[PDB]
Amino acid sequence: QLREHVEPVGLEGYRANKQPPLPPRKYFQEQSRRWRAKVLTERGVFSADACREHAEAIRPKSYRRRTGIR
RNA sequence: AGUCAUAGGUAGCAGAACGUUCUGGAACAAUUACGCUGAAAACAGUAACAGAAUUGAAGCUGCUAACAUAAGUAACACUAAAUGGAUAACAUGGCCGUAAGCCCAAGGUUUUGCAUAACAAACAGUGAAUACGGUU
Numbered sequence: 001q002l003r004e005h006v007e008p009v010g011l012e013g014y015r016a017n018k019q020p021p022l023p024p025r026k027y028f029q030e031q032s033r034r035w036r037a038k039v040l041t042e043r044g045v046f047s048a049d050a051c052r053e054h055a056e057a058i059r060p061k062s063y064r065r066r067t068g069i070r
Numbered sequence: 071a072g073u074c075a076u077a078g079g080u081a082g083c084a085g086a087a088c089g090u091u092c093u094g095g096a097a098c099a100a101u102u103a104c105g106c107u108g109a110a111a112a113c114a115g116u117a118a119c120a121g122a123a124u125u126g127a128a129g130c131u132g133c134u135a136a137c138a139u140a141a142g143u144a145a146c147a148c149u150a151a152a153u154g155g156a157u158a159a160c161a162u163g164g165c166c167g168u169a170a171g172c173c174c175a176a177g178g179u180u181u182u183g184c185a186u187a188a189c190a191a192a193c194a195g196u197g198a199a200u201a202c203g204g205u206u
């Protein structure tokens with residue numbers, strides 16, 4: 001609590017002290033899943049969208065950990 | 071934008087809104103979204119204005135589907151009996167023997183034969199010639 005409010009720790013810029021993003025929330029995961037199902041249905045497996053989405057899925061991602069319940 | 075007044079509720083009555091699908095206003099997601107939070111709630115984060123509704127579900131011993139629990143529990147006790155490193159051909163022992171043997175009928179309709187795994191059902195098999203049963 002003192003680290004949050006009393007000592008001066010969050011006083012630098014944004015480019016310093018920035019964090020990796022939190023992982024995508026479940027609504028956005030469901031939206032992306034629906035988009036991928038749409039793409040594989042009406043555009044095909046061998047499309048640029050499907051292959052690019054798979055290629056972006058295979059690469060690792062730098063994330064944080066959720067601390068709260070939301 | 072400063073003072074006051076009111077705000078427990080079942081049945082019931084009244085008012086304001088959220089969300090789902092579709093349509094009109096030319097087209098509001100081709101190449102996605104993803105700072106993770108905001109809001110009093112229903113919720114929001116891919117328009118808005120109107121309209122048409124098979125428009126909102128823990129709650130009907132409701133229906134359908136999937137998955138648990140009981141639980142690796144109960145069961146695998148009607149019988150003759152098995153043994154040799156094999157559901158053995160060989161050897162030993164046992165059981166039925168008015169049957170648990172043999173020949174047919176009704177019914178079934180290929181359930182019938184072949185490979186020391188295998189690639190095998192995709193392959194075979196039912197012969198009227200004794201005055202056999204039927205058909206008359």
Ligand SMILES: [Mg+2]
Nearest residue numbers: 076077078079
């Ligand atoms: Mg009241």
Ligand SMILES: [Mg+2]
Nearest residue numbers: 076077078079
């Ligand atoms: Mg009161």
Ligand SMILES: [Mg+2]
Nearest residue numbers: 093094095097
């Ligand atoms: Mg339109």
Ligand SMILES: [Mg+2]
Nearest residue numbers: 124125126127
């Ligand atoms: Mg209805």
Ligand SMILES: [Mg+2]
Nearest residue numbers: 141142143146
């Ligand atoms: Mg056992």
Ligand SMILES: [Mg+2]
Nearest residue numbers: 153156157158
């Ligand atoms: Mg034996």
Ligand SMILES: [Mg+2]
Nearest residue numbers: 175176177178
């Ligand atoms: Mg017969």
